[PDB]
Amino acid sequence: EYQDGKEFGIGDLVWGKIKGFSWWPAMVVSWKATSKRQAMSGMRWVQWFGDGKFSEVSADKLVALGLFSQHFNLATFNKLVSYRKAMYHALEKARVRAGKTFPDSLEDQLKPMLEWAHGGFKPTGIEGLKP
Numbered sequence: 558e559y560q561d562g563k564e565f566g567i568g569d570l571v572w573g574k575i576k577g578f579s580w581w582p583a584m585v586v587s588w589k590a591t592s593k594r595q596a597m598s599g600m601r602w603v604q605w606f607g608d609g610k611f612s613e614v615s616a617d618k619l620v621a622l623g624l625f626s627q628h629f630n631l632a633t634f635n636k637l638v639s640y641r642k643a644m645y646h647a648l649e650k651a652r653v654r655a656g657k658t659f660p661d662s663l664e665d666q667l668k669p670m671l672e673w674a675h676g677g678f679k680p681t682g683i684e685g686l687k688p
């Protein structure tokens with residue numbers, strides 16, 4: 558599955574861009590997770606953080622979550638609680654994968670995770686976000 562010459566494999570944390578939305582964090586999943594169909598060549602099933610829905614998205618409309626500063630939308634973050642919730646769930650997954658720990662509102666748990674992400678996911682850097 559996903560042998561089409563494009564990047565992103567199962568478990569990869571990504572930003573996904575679907576028409577009419579900010580870049581949104583997601584995880585690349587197997588089509589078997591979706592209960593739908595195999596993805597067309599050149600596409601990936603992703604599951605969006607925050608709402609848990611599945612979309613078939615072109616691999617060219619995906620970027621690594623680790624490219625964080627570049628794709629994080631501060632306006633969307635300020636405007637939408639659903640986006641903030643998505644960030645939390647996405648960064649929590651990132652955090653556990655990287656072996657990272659932080660020292661309790663949504664915005665308060667989020668604060669150091671966001672700082673971590675925005676700052677480059679130190680000390681591991683983005684290699685720590687790998688599945």
Ligand SMILES: CC[C@@H](CO)NCCN[C@@H](CC)CO
Nearest residue numbers: 575578581605607608610639
């Ligand atoms: C319209 C409902 C809102 C709240 O979850 N969706 C947030 C955006 N996430 C969708 C688009 C990336 C994925 O369904």
